[PDB]
Each structure stands twice: as structure tokens, then as C-alpha cells.
Amino acid sequence: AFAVDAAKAYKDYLASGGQPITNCVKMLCTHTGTGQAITVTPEANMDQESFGGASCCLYCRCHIDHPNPKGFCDLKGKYVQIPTTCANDPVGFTLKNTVCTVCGMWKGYGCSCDQ
Amino acid sequence: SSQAWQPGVAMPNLYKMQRMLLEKCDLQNYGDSATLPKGIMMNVAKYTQLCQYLNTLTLAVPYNMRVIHFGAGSDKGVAPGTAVLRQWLPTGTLLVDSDLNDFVSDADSTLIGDCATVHTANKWDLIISDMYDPKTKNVTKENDSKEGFFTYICGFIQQKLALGGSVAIKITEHSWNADLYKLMGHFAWWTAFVTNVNASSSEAFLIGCNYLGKPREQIDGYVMHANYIFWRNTNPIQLSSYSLFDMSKFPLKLRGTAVMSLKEGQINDMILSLLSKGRLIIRENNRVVISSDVLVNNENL
Ligand SMILES: C[S@@+](CC[C@H](N)C(=O)[O-])C[C@H]1O[C@@H](n2cnc3c(N)ncnc32)[C@H](O)[C@@H]1O
Ligand SMILES: [Cl-]
Ligand SMILES: [Cl-]
Ligand SMILES: [Cl-]
Ligand SMILES: [Zn+2]
Numbered sequence: 001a002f003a004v005d006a007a008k009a010y011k012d013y014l015a016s017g018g019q020p021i022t023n024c025v026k027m028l029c030t031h032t033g034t035g036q037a038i039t040v041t042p043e044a045n046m047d048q049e050s051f052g053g054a055s056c057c058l059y060c061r062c063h064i065d066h067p068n069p070k071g072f073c074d075l076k077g078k079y080v081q082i083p084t085t086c087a088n089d090p091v092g093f094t095l096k097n098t099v100c101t102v103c104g105m106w107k108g109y110g111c112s113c114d115q
Numbered sequence: 116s117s118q119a120w121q122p123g124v125a126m127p128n129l130y131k132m133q134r135m136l137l138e139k140c141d142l143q144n145y146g147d148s149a150t151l152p153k154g155i156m157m158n159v160a161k162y163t164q165l166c167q168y169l170n171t172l173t174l175a176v177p178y179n180m181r182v183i184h185f186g187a188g189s190d191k192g193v194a195p196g197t198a199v200l201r202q203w204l205p206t207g208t209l210l211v212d213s214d215l216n217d218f219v220s221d222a223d224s225t226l227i228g229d230c231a232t233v234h235t236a237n238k239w240d241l242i243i244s245d246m247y248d249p250k251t252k253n254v255t256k257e258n259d260s261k262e263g264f265f266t267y268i269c270g271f272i273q274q275k276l277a278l279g280g281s282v283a284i285k286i287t288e289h290s291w292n293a294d295l296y297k298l299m300g301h302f303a304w305w306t307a308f309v310t311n312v313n314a315s316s317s318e319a320f321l322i323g324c325n326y327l328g329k330p331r332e333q334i335d336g337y338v339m340h341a342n343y344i345f346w347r348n349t350n351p352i353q354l355s356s357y358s359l360f361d362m363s364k365f366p367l368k369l370r371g372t373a374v375m376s377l378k379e380g381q382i383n384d385m386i387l388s389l390l391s392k393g394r395l396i397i398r399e400n401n402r403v404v405i406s407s408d409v410l411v412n413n414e415n416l
């Protein structure tokens with residue numbers, strides 16, 4: 001059967017040099033939060049920006065179905081913390097990266113479980 | 116003076132007591148823009164200052180609070196204001212938003228369409244509106260009370276705002292309605308609030324604090340809007356972003372304000388006192404059900 005692959009489409013679009021999705025909603029916050037990846041309120045630390053989740057979700061922003069079988073969205077209604085160095089492309093970041101199921105941090109951007 | 120470190124400026128009471136005539140709004144800093152923090156959208160900064168101001172009032176904040184946000188879509192397809200509202204509101208607060216065109220939101224439910232198609236079974240503790248038609252700032256015709264979405268909003272307040280609840284409704288020099296001002300007299304307190312980030316605009320938010328369901332004071336809304344313009348015309352507000360850099364006390368204190376279902380016979384002076392203090396919400400505490408009316412047409416042959 002045939003399902004469009006949007007994740008791959010955006011990744012190849014980025015590699016080919018296309019400009020990242022814009023108008024992700026960045027929040028004002030203290031930048032003294034827990035640094036966890038996805039939270040119910042902005043939790044950015046000194047090295048993160050906080051964004052509204054829906055605006056950083058590729059499926060939300062492109063009006064396409066979510067790859068969850070039930071269509072549920074990880075990010076919508078929450079806040080996603082993006083390393084300030086990757087905050088030019090929050091959608092690409094969230095798509096390409098993974099939250100540690102134990103400590104709640106981004107794998108490779110805060111998760112120290114593996115040390 | 117110190118107004119620059121506030122989230123904004125509220126209409127001083129003495130201006131509300133005047134009997135001015137409607138003039139054109141002439142803001143000396145018109146066209147200026149405040150310096151927003153790096154990467155921060157205007158509508159994020161504006162709603163943040165609004166909520167910062169709201170934290171200084173006596174809002175009822177019950178458990179299972181219910182908030183509805185009209186005019187929530189931007190021209191970008193996202194809902195910056197809804198995101199600030201959800202950050203501000205206690206976690207778990209039921210948040211519904213709506214706008215004419217399609218948009219992506221962090222709200223628990225979003226209704227797309229004219230606001231007049233929106234119906235809800237239940238009552239609300241807080242109503243936010245940023246509804247605005249920019250075609251209204253037409254400076255060559257007379258500036259009369261506007262109807263449109265404002266007629267809907269006055270009806271929605273009377274019918275679906277819980278007693279003790281609060282509202283904030285964007286207006287401008289030209290986007291305003293006299294009955295809405297009149298309604299402000301149905302609250303324990305009211306003001307027009309100008310965010311410091313947008314002080315160069317005739318925009319303000321009409322805030323009614325703690326709804327009482329009946330006129331507490333009688334307001335002529337043509338006169339009050341003229342009072343509001345007179346204030347803006349004679350009180351330059353210095354653009355400022357300063358309050359955006361301090362967010363430590365931003366979240367709305369969950370006060371666990373009490374909810375009681377009550378009948379009109381039972382609203383006495385003690386109750387009304389409590390309503391007036393942000394200490395009581397009166398409404399059903401049922402489940403929250405909303406709908407958007409859909410017009411059906413077949414355009415074939
Ligand atoms: C300045 S914008 C909203 C900005 C948005 N709140 C944000 O957070 O960035 C004005 C909005 O009012 C809406 N709106 C205007 N008139 C409406 C009407 N009769 N019914 C429903 N929505 C309306 C527009 O579609 C438009 O999105
Ligand atoms: Cl897009
Ligand atoms: Cl009056
Ligand atoms: Cl009642
Ligand atoms: Zn999504």
C-alpha cells in the first residue's frame with residue numbers, strides 16, 4: 001500500500017538546501033527550567049529555546065496524518081525545548097531526534113543515562 | 116515613568132468618568148516599534164504582557180478551569196496567543212480556540228469558522244478575543260459602533276460566561292462596540308489595557324473582571340470609547356519590552372476558586388460580594404461540549 005513519507009521529504013528537502021519551516025512559536029520563559037525535551041510548560045534552560053509544540057510538529061504544520069496509529073500528536077498542547085544552536089529548524093530537530101524514555105531529555109542533547 | 120517596567124498601562128479611572136466626544140486617534144509614537152527579544156513574535160510578546168497584567172487582577176481560577184479564545188489564528192497558520200495562554204493557565208486548563216481560517220493550535224480543541232457558528236453547552240471562566248477585521252481602520256468615514264463579531268461576543272458573554280468569570284476583548288480606534296463597553300458595567304471592575312509592546316497602536320484590551328450578570332453601573336459605550344480615545348490621545352505610552360525579560364512570576368496562581376451551581380433566586384449580597392472578590396464561580400461543572408455549525412450546499416448542475 002501507499003503512504004506518503006513526509007519525514008523523508010523534509011529531510012531530503014533540507015539536505016538539498018531548502019529553508020527550514022518557519023513561524024514556529026517561540027515562548028518567553030526564564031531559561032532556568034529542567035531542560036527536558038517535551039513538557040507541559042516551557043522548561044528551556046540556558047542553552048535552549050522553548051517553542052509551542054504544535055508549531056514544531058511536521059505533521060501538524062503540513063496538515064497530514066500523524067504516524068501514530070491513533071493519529072495522536074507528541075507535541076501538540078505541550079512545549080518542546082530546542083538547543084539554541086538548532087533553533088533555526090525546530091521541526092527538523094524534533095523530527096530527527098529522540099527523547100530518552102527514562103530521563104526525559106533529548107538523546108545526545110542532555111541525556112546522560114548512558115555514562 | 117516606571118510605566119516602562121510594567122506589562123502595559125490601564126485606563127486611569129478618572130478618564131472613565133469623563134463625557135468626551137469621539138475624536139480621531141493621533142498617537143505621537145505611531146509607527147514606532149518596540150525592540151522585541153531575539154526571535155520573539157509580536158503576538159507572543161503582546162499576549163505575554165496581557166497575561167502579566169491579568170495576574171494583577173482578581174481572576175477566579177477554579178479547578179477544571181474553562182477558557183475560550185476567539186480570533187486565535189494568525190496569518191502564519193499557527194496560534195501564538197493560544198500558546199501563551201496555555202503556558203500561563205494552570206496545566207490541565209481546558210482551552211478552546213477558534214478563528215475564521217484554518218490554523219494549527221496547542222488548544223485542546225479548535226473550531227474553524229465565523230464565530231457566530233460557535234456553540235457550547237457549558238459556561239466559561241475566561242474569554243479572550245483577538246478578533247479583528249483590519250478593513251475597519253478606514254480613516255475617511257465616520258467611526259460608528261461596529262456590530263459583526265462584536266454582537267456575537269456580547270451575546271456569548273451574557274449567555275455563556277460563568278458568574279465570577281472574566282473577559283479580555285481586543286478593540287482599536289475603529290474596532291469597537293458600544294454594548295460591549297456597556298457590558299463592562301456588568302462586572303465588578305473593568306478597564307482598557309494597552310500592552311507596552313504595542314503602545315504605538317490604538318489597540319487595547321477591554322477587560323471585565325468578575326462577571327456579575329447584571330448592571331453594577333450604567334455605561335454609555337459611545338461616550339466611554341470617546342473617553343478611551345481621549346486618554347490615548349493625551350497620554351503617550353513609551354514602547355517597552357522590559358517586562359518580557361522577567362517571567363518568574365508569570366504562571367497564573369491556581370487558586371482552586373470554588374464553583375457552585377446556583378439559581379438566580381440564590382444570588383444575594385454575600386454571593387455577589389464573593390463573586391466581586393475573585394472568590395467564586397457560578398456555573399454547572401458538567402463536561403465541556405462545543406460545536407461548529409456547518410452550512411450544507413450542493414453546487415452541482
Ligand atoms: C490579529 S488576528 C489574530 C492574531 C492571533 N490571535 C495570534 O495569536 O497571533 C485577527 C483575527 O481575527 C479573526 N477573525 C476576524 N474576524 C472574525 C470573525 N467574524 N469571526 C471569527 N473570527 C474572526 C481573523 O481571521 C484573524 O485571525
Ligand atoms: Cl509549512
Ligand atoms: Cl459613561
Ligand atoms: Cl445563574
Ligand atoms: Zn502534530
Ligand SMILES: [Zn+2]
Nearest residue numbers: 100103111113
Ligand atoms: Zn536519559
